[PDB]
Write a protein that binds this ligand. Structure first.
Ligand code: MG
Length: 1066
RNA sequence: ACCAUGGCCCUACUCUGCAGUUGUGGAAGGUCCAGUUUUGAGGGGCUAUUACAAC
């Protein structure tokens, strides 16, 4: 088999990027090893998989971690592993429905093996390669299988293009219509991934384009673009063509995600303002989903460093941004937000026998939660001596990741975590200090074991934060804070009175809290209607609901299995069915513990580590009908005391699953579990129907839920045990009184005006502003498709893009239009039971309608949230610098704005910490829209070693960007200098040429040695050549002193020049 | 081939994340209903999701 001509003609590019591909792979493998405490197919992580089904797995938690993370960092592995399952079923005449570690291992073994081969050929002037001999083992076992896998991978990757970029059949037909001939692979197609490569046996190998594709699976998008742009793989499509962009996008769509090295930026009032403006230029994710491909394309921007960026929000950061704004601004004197500052780890037992009978370290974690301004808390968290707060306890370095560490001397320690706000369950928790300028409230640690935490004063809905921000903007943060504190103190006075039994229908109004903001139980208690929930009703209902769900799951599973055995089940298309044992094992572990009876305050039920083991054990269980492996699996549940004689709290029905025979694998186990669950619940239903009393493990009659509430008992729980739950519409009356006094707001009906409405009226009427233009763009919703009722000739339902006015009117007419929809839709089901159809449609319309309504409500919240960020950011920056900005308006903000605030030029300075050092990058003048550049530079692996060479931690942004682009241009020229050096050595010393013919591997290190021994170079020169060459392969800079360098932005250029001169030879 | 019918809760803001139990709590949050809302406003039902304690 011959090396493809594309490879031979672009050898310096294939050489460079093959090395980058292999290094990136090793990086991921190394990361996974470290985090999990475990010839790339011999890596510890890959060995683990290889051995993972050699008998009953002793480290299921590790196996499952490796399988999950490999699919995160290598997204193409989901597609290829699915193809490898289907392949094996073929080969061994099996019907395995689920992907396992053998699939993952085999895909990656082959990918790595072929990558390594091409890396070696392209990085050597002359070597012998036995592996290219036609009909050899390498070709038959590894390379030829991989070419077919890659070709099948690309079928699915092109399907993914439709989802990810909105491409239509017409857009992709120049590839999809021409890949296969009539079905063969069309090796004559210009983007064919397979070719004969002059193989006399006439078997399909990877083509040059195919080799490029394999490499690009292991590159970052930036390098995919640099690499492919050098290659003549675009037939006659030109640089600006859509076809070129489609090709390149197809080669990056599922490529490697590299683990990020942690960065910590210094925040300020200015930085927060700029983080806010860069938030509002991006598309909210809920909106992005609804937009046409053209308008989605408008958020795909080219940066200053000529890199395409998706300007889309990955999460709603409104609330954290607002908290940073308040903290860095020092705007609240008394209120402090709930922060986490790491976790305490203490070793309970070094050798704990677990429910699978394997010994493991038992480490307990407690969060270090507290209250203060993020900067002040962070200054307290890490002392100079590297201890936490005033605790004495060591904070372990972030790079040290031995979580399995069994040495008692190493414990306790605190995990190093930058102070962040705790923002879970759409809440903000806060602590109210009596005095101003209080110090951060860090938790005390007792017995090196207990973290003594503090119940928050009170908790606010994140949906209340827009009105708080708006109130802050109109009145001032101090007035805002006084109002939160006053509301809090009213609830406290109420709950104190409850505890004295001094709250009546006659005096409830005196407490100053509206009925709609009192708990129903207080309202029940003063009305004389206090009652518990009816436990028997709840049991009867729960049993019925669960029986129904059990049957739903039985059916879905039988359906999916049949679907998975079908030819029509196509990955990347919409009705694609997959059975994940991970997903099965999640269901089973939750349910097994749900049905485990509690005793002794719940101290008998499965604990955290054993839970993780049980769940993982299930996920990977697959006896080969090996008797021991079956016994081992059953034994786990015996040791958890769920089945077995002499158990006192057994699971009610799990033991039936193991009666007669042990299930052979996770899939058998899930099926049998669900059948047994169905029989248990049917029995219960039948006993309920006879009027008998039944009990289920997870309903407990002694819980307060079921009893009548008392005033005094409930008073104490509300005062002492929980945070105060702050009401919605706290700030409304004050907001409305203010706005009523403004003459521009004169013609507003304030009796039908919520705060969402009034923010928008404020922007329009007081400020002559409006929301960003992309909130007027037409949107698509399935539900509105159904209501519009428009089909193509073939008879599919059309995807409309409507305006808000259109949808207003469809919604008014939804009853009629739903009637039409159902009539047509039912016919189309029948053409492909009356009750079953009506049910199928019922669910279709409900789900769709609910999706549409929620989406529209949330986008309307994003609008006014953006108004508030814009307003606050603009206020910060107005009062900074010699900056004038009364003219700027939210309506001008756009993802690549050429006007308004984002186009303004100001000096900037970005300070951050990475790997224990602290650096600053400055600009003398920079458009606000480019502030994101700094994170891109700080994130770059080279930033550290580069700044070691500059000899300054402070550097110009423009200089570093130029340096990084010049580095990127030098890297292939390094490859060429090596090539010409090797070539000289071969021409001068025929020893080397002979060593090729005698089938020995000649490498660079060897050639340096020959050059040294014949005094073509000396040790100094040898060492430099070696070190520079290594630095470029690492995609990094060499250590200081190796070579004399110039200043930025010519460091890489100067290193390239030195290499070139040290490679001349006598 | 085309066409048609994550275990979960990360393109700097911390995935080195989240994913055991028991208790407490539904004024909040989630979810469902509909002559409800393009004004996270209101109504009705259901529900421990944030937190803390103990293990
Ligand atoms: Mg309300």
């Amino acid at each position: 088999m011959n090396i493809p001509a594309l490879v031979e003609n672009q050898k310096k590019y294939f050489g460079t990027y093959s090395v980058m591909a292999m290094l990136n792979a090793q990086t991921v493998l190394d990361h996974i090893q470290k985090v999990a405490d475990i010839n790339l197919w011999f890596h510890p992580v890959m060995s683990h998989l290889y051995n993972a089904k050699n008998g009953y797995d002793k480290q299921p938690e590790k196996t499952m971690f490796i399988i999950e993370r490999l699919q995160s960092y290598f997204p193409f592995l989901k597609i290829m592993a699915e193809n490898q399952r289907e392949y094996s079923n073929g080969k061994y005449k099996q019907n395995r429905v689920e992907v396992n570690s053998n699939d993952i291992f085999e895909v990656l073994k082959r990918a790595f093996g072929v990558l390594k081969m091409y890396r070696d050929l392209t990085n050597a002037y002359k070597t012998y390669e036995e592996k290219l001999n036609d009909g050899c083992e390498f070709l038959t076992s590894t390379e030829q299988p991989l070419s077919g896998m890659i070709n099948n991978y690309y079928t699915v990757a092109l399907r993914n293009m439709n989802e990810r970029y909105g491409y239509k059949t017409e857009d992709l037909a120049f590839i999809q219509d021409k890949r296969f001939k009539f079905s063969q692979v069309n090796t004559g197609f210009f983007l064919s991934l397979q070719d004969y490569n002059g193989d006399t046996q006439k078997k399909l190998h990877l083509s040059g384009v195919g080799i490029a594709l394999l490499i690009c699976l292991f590159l970052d998008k930036q390098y995919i673009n640099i690499f492919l742009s050098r290659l003549p793989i675009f037939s006659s499509y030109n640089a600006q063509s859509e076809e070129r962009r489609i090709i390149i996008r197809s080669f990056g769509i599922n490529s490697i995600k590299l683990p990020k090295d942690r960065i910590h930026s210094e925040k300020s009032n200015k930085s927060v303002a700029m983080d806010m403006l860069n938030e509002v230029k991006r598309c909210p994710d809920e909106l992005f989903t609804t937009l046409s491909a053209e308008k989605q394309s408008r958020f795909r921007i080219i940066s200053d460093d000529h890199n395409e960026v998706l300007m889309k929000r990955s999460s709603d950061r409104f609330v954290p941004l607002l908290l940073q704004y308040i903290d860095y601004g020092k705007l609240f004197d008394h209120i402090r937000f709930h922060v986490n500052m790491g976790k305490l780890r203490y070793l309970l037992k070094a050798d704990k026998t677990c429910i699978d009978g394997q010994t493991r370290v038992r480490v307990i974690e407690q969060p270090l939660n507290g209250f203060g301004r993020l900067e002040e808390a962070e200054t307290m968290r890490k002392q100079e001596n590297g201890t936490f707060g005033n605790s004495g306890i060591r904070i372990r370095d972030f790079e040290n990741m031995k979580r399995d560490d069994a040495n008692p001397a190493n414990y306790p320690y605190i995990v190093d975590t930058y102070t962040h706000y705790i923002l879970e369950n759409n809440k903000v928790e806060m602590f109210i200090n009596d005095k101003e300028d209080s110090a951060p409230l860090l938790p005390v640690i007792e017995d090196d074991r207990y973290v003594v935490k503090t119940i928050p004063s009170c908790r606010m809905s994140t949906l209340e934060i827009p009105a708080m921000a708006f109130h802050m903007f109109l009145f001032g943060s101090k007035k805002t804070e006084k109002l939160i504190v006053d509301v809090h103190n009213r609830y406290k006075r109420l709950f104190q009175a409850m505890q004295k039994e001094e709250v009546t229908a006659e005096n409830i109004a005196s407490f100053g809290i509206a009925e709609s903001d009192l708990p129903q139980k207080i309202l029940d208690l003063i009305s004389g209607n206090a009652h518990g929930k009816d436990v028997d009703a709840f049991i009867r209902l729960t049993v019925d609901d669960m029986l129904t769900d059990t049957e739903r799951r039985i059916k879905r599973f039988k359906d999916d299995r049949k679907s998975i055995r079908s030819a029509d089940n196509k990955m990347g298309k919409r009705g694609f069915k997959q059975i994940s044992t991970g997903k099965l094992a999640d269901f089973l572990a939750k349910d097994i513990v749900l049905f485990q009876p509690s005793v002794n305050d719940g101290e008998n039920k499965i604990t955290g580590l054993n839970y993780r083991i049980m769940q993982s054990a299930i996920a990977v269980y697959d006896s080969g009908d090996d008797y021991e492996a079956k016994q081992q699996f059953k034994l786990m549940f015996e040791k958890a005391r769920l089945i077995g004689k002499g158990t006192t709290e057994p699971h009610p029905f799990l033991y039936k699953v193991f009666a007669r025979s042990i299930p052979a694998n996770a899939v058998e186990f899930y099926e049998r579990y669900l059948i047994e669950r169905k029989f248990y619940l049917t029995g219960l239903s039948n006993e309920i129907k006879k009027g008998n009393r039944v009990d289920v493990p997870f309903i407990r009659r002694d819980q307060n839920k079921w009893k009548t509430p008392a005033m005094k008992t409930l008073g104490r729980i509300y005062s002492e045990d929980l945070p105060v739950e702050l009401p919605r519409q706290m700030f409304d009356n004050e907001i409305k009184s203010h706005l009523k006094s403004l003459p521009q707001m004169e013609g507003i009906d304030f009796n039908n005006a919520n705060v969402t409405y009034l923010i928008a009226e404020y922007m329009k009427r007081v400020l002559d502003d409006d929301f960003q233009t992309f909130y007027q763009w037409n949107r698509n919703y399935r539900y509105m498709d159904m209501l519009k009722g428009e089909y193509d000739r073939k008879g599919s339902l059309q995807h409309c893009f409507t305006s808000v006015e259109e949808r207003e009117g469809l919604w008014k007419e939804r009853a009629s239009r739903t009637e039409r929809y159902r009539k047509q839709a039912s016919n189309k089901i029948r053409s492909n039971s009356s009750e079953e159809i009506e049910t199928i449609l019922d669910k279709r319309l409900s789900n769709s309608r609910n999706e549409y309504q929620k989406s529209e409500k949330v986008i309307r919240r994003y609008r006014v949230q953006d108004a508030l960020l814009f307003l606050l950011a603009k206020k910060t920056l107005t009062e900074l610098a010699d900056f004038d900005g009364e003219r700027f308006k939210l309506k001008e903000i756009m993802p690549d704005a050429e006007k308004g605030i984002l186009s303004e030029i100001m000096p900037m300075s970005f300070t951050f910490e990475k790997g224990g050092k602290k650096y600053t990058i400055t600009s003398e003048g920079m458009k606000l829209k480019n502030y994101g550049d700094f994170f891109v530079l700080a994130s770059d692996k080279r930033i550290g070693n580069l700044l070691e060479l500059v000899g300054s931690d402070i550097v110009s942004k423009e200089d570093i960007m130029e340096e990084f682009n010049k580095y990127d241009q030098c890297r292939p020229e390094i490859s060429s200098i090596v090539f010409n050096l090797e070539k000289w050595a071969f021409d001068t010393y025929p020893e080397l040429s002979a060593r090729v013919d005698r089938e020995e591997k000649v490498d660079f290190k060897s050639i340096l040695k020959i050059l040294l021994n014949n005094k073509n170079i000396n040790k100094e020169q040898s060492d430099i050549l070696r070190k520079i060459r290594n630095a470029f392969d690492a995609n990094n800079y060499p250590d200081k002193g190796v070579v004399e360098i110039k200043a930025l932005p010519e460091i890489a250029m100067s290193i390239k020049k030195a290499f070139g001169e040290y490679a001349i030879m006598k």
